Amino acid sequence: TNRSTVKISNVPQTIVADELLRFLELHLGEDTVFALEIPTTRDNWKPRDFARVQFTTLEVKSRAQLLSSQSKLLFKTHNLRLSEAYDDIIPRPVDPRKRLDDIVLTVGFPESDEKRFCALEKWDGVRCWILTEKRRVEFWVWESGDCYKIEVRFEDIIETLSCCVNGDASEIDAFLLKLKYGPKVFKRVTDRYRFCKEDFDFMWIRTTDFSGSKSIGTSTCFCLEVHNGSTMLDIFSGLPYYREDTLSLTYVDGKTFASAAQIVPLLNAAILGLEFPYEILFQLNALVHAQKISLFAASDMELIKILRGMSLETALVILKKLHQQSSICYDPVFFVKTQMASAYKRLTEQNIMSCQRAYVTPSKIYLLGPELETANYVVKNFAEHVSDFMRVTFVEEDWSKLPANALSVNSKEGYFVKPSRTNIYNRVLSILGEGITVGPKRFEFLAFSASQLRGNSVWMFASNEKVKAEDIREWMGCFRKIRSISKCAARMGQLFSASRQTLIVRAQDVEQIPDIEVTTDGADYCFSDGIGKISLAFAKQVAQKCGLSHVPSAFQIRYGGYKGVIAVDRSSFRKLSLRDSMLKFDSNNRMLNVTRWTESMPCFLNREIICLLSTLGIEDAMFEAMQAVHLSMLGNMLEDRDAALNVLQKLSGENSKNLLVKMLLQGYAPSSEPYLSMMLRVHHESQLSELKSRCRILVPKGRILIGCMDEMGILEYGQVYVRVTLTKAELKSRDQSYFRKIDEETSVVIGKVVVTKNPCLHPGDIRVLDAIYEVHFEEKGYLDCIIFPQKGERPHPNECSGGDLDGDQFFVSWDEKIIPSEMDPPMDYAGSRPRLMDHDVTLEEIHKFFVDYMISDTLGVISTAHLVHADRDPEKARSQKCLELANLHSRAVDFAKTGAPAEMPYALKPREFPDFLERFEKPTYISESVFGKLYRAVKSSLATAKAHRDMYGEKLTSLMIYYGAANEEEILTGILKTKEMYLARDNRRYGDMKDRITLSVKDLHKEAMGWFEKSCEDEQQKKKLASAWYYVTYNPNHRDEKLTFLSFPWIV
RNA sequence: CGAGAGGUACUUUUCUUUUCUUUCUUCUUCGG
RNA sequence: CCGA
Ligand SMILES: [Mg+2]
């Protein structure tokens, strides 16, 4: 009953569409058929055995279905059989009243504090199709001959009104729409088996704004002027968030805001003066980009004259309160009347940097503000022009990922197909080339990081008087010796990691050791991928600024364009020594910084891990017990204190000294202590949710740690040594079969482990590596580093999908329940041929590589198609459709390195999803594999003091509404109970705000210690004043009418 | 009996399923 | 947000 398009099962193949049209109009009524389409295998001379017919109403569709079920449709000795189609031939609503024809559409925004409306442009004679089934509305705006489809979804509309232009309340002739996001703009571009009854033989492509004055990009409010709205109120009541009230308006003249730049929603800084500060104007413009202050409410002189002469802190704390409230403030003058050093010091201690984040849509721009992000190397060596850095990302109108059809649309012209670049392509290229111009500044393309390329983000810098965009680029190094287009861009994002700086090593302290390599059977291999050597004391001097008591044996390090780990030798003689396979460019700096050193974090059992280990003769029955042993201590965590220590000592951090571990041993029951009872309940809800969503079966006998190679020569092909550290449960039973307590903290292994990587798809990635013991290996002090053999045939890191040794993880486990004795041969490791140019990079090929990284990026579908093609097909991970996908994954993960795309073919998509997915829109099917059993196994389980308190309250309650958190536990833990529209489809963008709220509340915990030491410096007398802080949050008599917080006094 | 002319006489003699693809715009995976 |  949703659609009227009917698919006929058996039509004759000797007919034309007119013969079927006349037959259907002879049996049914006259001209009751809207669309008719017979698909052809060839171009125009080979029709197929079925056809699609779309009727005008539902009654004639039901009558045709009743005639077909009674066998009364005989067309040339063929009984027609009707069924249901997949979609409409033309996206047209089947309603005679919803198709509003020849109406007036005008755009604008409320100008003054009242409910007025200023019009920029006016469109006369447009269409209006309200698609209830597809949950969108579309307009057809004709301009200069061609038309432009403007698609507006239902989720973008937040307020539907009923206005009146003519003044009379009974003459309802206007409908005001309030759009949170922007609309999708389309364009019409320019025979025998299609009748179609109208002019619909064209195609829609996503282009930029069509108006010469560019009014649509600053048109967050709409006004649908209808001819006569009397019975249309029953149709407009189906719109979401429809306020059932009649309200008048005033049509203000608004042709003043007429810009010609690509960045439309910006205030004219030349009119208000170039002497305005950037810190206030950027926040005032970001409030305009949000749905709090309109354009005319901020561009008036009564707001600039009252905000120009003031201090910069006082004018910012009253502008942050405008973003604090969720109500749309119509009069900003009335709010600021009721509203009335450390930043440079706080960057080198906790890597706190406030960067201006932007979101570029195909229509407008969305500036957010100086958000707290992790400071990298470049902004820490450039801590004087922090207001010139900007993170720019290219997203959709609803802040989602840009697909491959919004730009570079394919069109078969001539003999072969050719991709056609639309107006979004030339817009993103113009933005990357020229730049954006907000305030008295202009942001130029600096570079982009390795993860910025996958997330479609880029770094931008403004050329000031001191430095420029070229000087900061040549300060990193010289990139003229790289003749590639992808590698020259990838080496400019190498020096952008989230690191902590250390002392500078001079240029005289270099020692180049000649490397080692093996060439077996014509295949080139190497053992010194990114490894190096370091001394005993140098680890102490590099750990003196990080606070590491336990000396790590291997840690990833970077300086001067070199990348990889370094190992500790006990026969060291110099301070620093380097290999030759670290050089990427000839830099001119040698400042040292460390990203992440070493951590003995226990592992989990991922989906591809089960997919690759349920093939080698290991049974599927133990995978349910491996999660049953976890849920037996996870389920009774809410009502017991014994399982609460075991489910927190190794779940999130092994030696994790946090607030949940100090009150775990010397603590009470979870019935009392609500500060413990809240976070433990939300950790239980997190542990069930991230187990139901993805496979995260925890095992205590396995770890995850960074590996390195050692210069000993004893280790051979097939034998390593694992000197793991003893956890809180490893010291309870030292006498084990495969484990051996060599010391108190160091618990070595004597069994056999499996070593793989985090992405793995080929069955040759599984390899058995026996842990042996030697006195020369135990005397070298290889703590928290799985060492690798020096010689052999090929290196064992390279056996795990061609992995190098440059600061990457390794999944290891010495469990003895599996049967890994069956072994498969490995796959190839050499990628595609590199592409070298005959000239130098002119800084436009990097723009082309960044824009063409969005298209032809099928990395998101290969791991999905492999996981479904291993569920639906027996002899999984060994069929040909698994080997082609395993080759395409290794070709697609090198797309950031070399410029060779993946090109995911057709007849390989599954078109059917298993049970263990969150895709509730696809026609799914019940999975019979072990993954469906593991998905059902969790469904079987789920069946003086007052001033400080009041200032902590107002310092904490703002970021809940600012981030979208409804409670304190959503923002103080990391995981929010509610999700947004674009965050429900992007895990990487969800992790951004997940880390960003923790990095935000870290500074709140810093100022909670700062105010505590500002109140009293004595520690022995602080326990008597902390009792009052506990009593005002525990006792109900000291609780005021506001919602007080219980996580306030728990600072230590 | 040899030469020159015209005539009967190789006719399809090996094409392969006739069911082969357009219902399209869709979550990379891991750890801080 | 960052590193395979
Ligand atoms: Mg690596």
UniProtKB/Swiss-Prot annotation:
Disruption phenotype: Late flowering and absence of siRNAs derived from FWA tandem repeat regions. Loss of de novo methylation. Increased expression of retrotransposon-derived solo long terminal repeat (solo LTR) and SDC due to their derepression; levels are even higher in the double mutant rdr2-1 jmj24-1. Keywords: Magnesium, Metal-binding, Nucleotidyltransferase, Nucleus, RNA-binding, RNA-directed RNA polymerase, RNA-mediated gene silencing, Transferase. It catalyses: RNA(n) + a ribonucleoside 5'-triphosphate = RNA(n+1) + diphosphate. The keyword Transferase applies. GO terms for cellular component: nucleolus; nucleoplasm; nucleus. Pfam families: PH_RDR2 (PF24823), RdRP (PF05183). Its EC number is 2.7.7.48. Mg(2+) binds at D804, D806, D808. It is found in: Nucleus, Nucleoplasm; Nucleus, Nucleolus; Nucleus. GO terms for molecular function: DNA/RNA hybrid binding; metal ion binding; RNA-directed RNA polymerase activity; single-stranded RNA binding. Transmembrane segments: none annotated. The keyword Coiled coil does not apply. It comes from the Eukaryota. One of its GO terms (biological process) is defense response to fungus. PANTHER family: RNA-DEPENDENT RNA POLYMERASE, RNA-DEPENDENT RNA POLYMERASE 2. RDR2 is non-functional in the absence of associated Pol IV. RNA-dependent direct polymerase involved in the production of small interfering RNAs (siRNAs). Binds to single-stranded RNA (ssRNA); engages ssRNAs longer than 7 nucleotides and initiates internal to their 3' ends. Able to transcribe the RNA of an RNA/DNA hybrid, the transcript produced by Pol IV, if its 3' end is accessible, to generate double-stranded small interfering RNAs (dsRNAs) precursor essential for establishing and maintaining DNA methylation. This is RNA-dependent RNA polymerase 2. It comes from Arabidopsis thaliana. The gene is RDR2.
